[PDB]
């Protein structure tokens, strides 16, 4: 009875935001478009252009700002059950594990040691080596030890049927990764989408190259990446794009060579 249902719309433009009668153009999904006003229980500064809101069904007045829409497939990519592998289960990778931890774990655990000296820790690690050398094992160890949000992305999961969908998933992945104070994204088998750009006359791997370009833009572009520390593992690092293999996107390159 008391709690009325609220239809989800998207605010489009605020007219006369300065004055005391600001009108809000909302786009109610597949329903319609309306010019409404905020309810008395919502502050005018709590609604911004382009954000999802929830409005009533009678006068469509904006009742509650809403979180941005995230694809459910992207949402499930975040790890909720940590793996059963610790760093004690990886042998012969002392230096590799130390280098990985001082990038992906130490800055999150003890940031105070870095801000004091004006130090900006690396925000990207590429684990590479022959198959079975322990790249995904070390990633699972990181996910087990980490306390921040850990997201596992397999490159083959970024391949989509339609044009621009993979880039959309990458954008939403980095959008939902930015809704956390600290976050880790694991890109297992990044060579699925991280291949080098080429022009073969036809449209050879154009869409996958666009997905990789979107990932690169999210890693180091005009907008700051945020507190996201990415992590990619591949057994074919020679196929990766030079722009993806560049510091600022993959700052550390940890080699999982065969054990001595």
């Amino acid at each position: 009875q008391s709690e009325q249902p609220l239809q989800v719309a998207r605010c489009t433009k605020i007219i006369n935001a300065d004055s005391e009668d600001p009108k809000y153009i909302i786009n109610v999904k597949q329903f319609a478009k309306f010019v409404v006003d905020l309810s008395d229980q919502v502050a005018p500064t709590d609604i911004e252009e382009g954000m999802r809101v929830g409005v009533d069904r009678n006068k469509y007045q904006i009742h509650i700002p809403l979180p941005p829409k995230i694809d459910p497939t992207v949402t499930m990519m975040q790890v909720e059950e940590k793996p059963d592998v610790t760093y004690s289960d990886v042998g012969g990778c002392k230096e590799q594990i130390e280098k990985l931890r001082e990038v992906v774990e130490t800055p999150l655990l003890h940031p105070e040691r870095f801000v004091n000296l004006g130090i900006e820790p690396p925000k990207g690690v590429l684990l590479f080596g022959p198959p079975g050398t322990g790249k995904t094992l070390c990633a699972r160890a990181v996910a087990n030890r980490t306390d921040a949000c850990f997201i596992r992305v397999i490159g083959s999961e970024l391949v989509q049927k339609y044009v621009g969908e993979g880039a959309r998933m990458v954008r939403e992945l980095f959008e939902m990764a930015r809704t956390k104070k600290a976050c880790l994204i694991f890109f297992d088998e990044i060579d699925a989408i991280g291949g080098a750009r080429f022009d073969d006359g036809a449209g050879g791997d154009n869409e996958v190259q666009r997905t990789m370009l979107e990932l690169i833009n999210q890693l180091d572009g005009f907008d700051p990446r945020g507190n996201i520390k990415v992590l990619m593992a591949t057994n074919r690092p020679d196929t990766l794009d030079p722009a993806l293999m560049r510091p600022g996107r993959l700052d550390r390159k940890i080699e999982f060579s065969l054990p001595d």
Partner: protein, 49 residues
């Protein structure tokens, strides 16, 4: 419980779990709604999609 559910009971898609008793759900027509999850719902069966 039957009276509270009513009839018919529409089939939608759980788009997002905003709160313990609040969620964004999309009906079959593609329109989303910010609705309330009632107590008798098996809240551990709720996942996006």
């Amino acid at each position: 419980v039957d009276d509270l559910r009513g009839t018919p009971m529409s089939v939608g898609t759980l788009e997002e779990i905003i709160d313990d008793n609040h969620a964004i759900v999309s009906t079959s027509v593609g329109s989303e709604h910010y609705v309330s999850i009632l107590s008798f719902v098996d809240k551990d069966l709720l996942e996006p999609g």
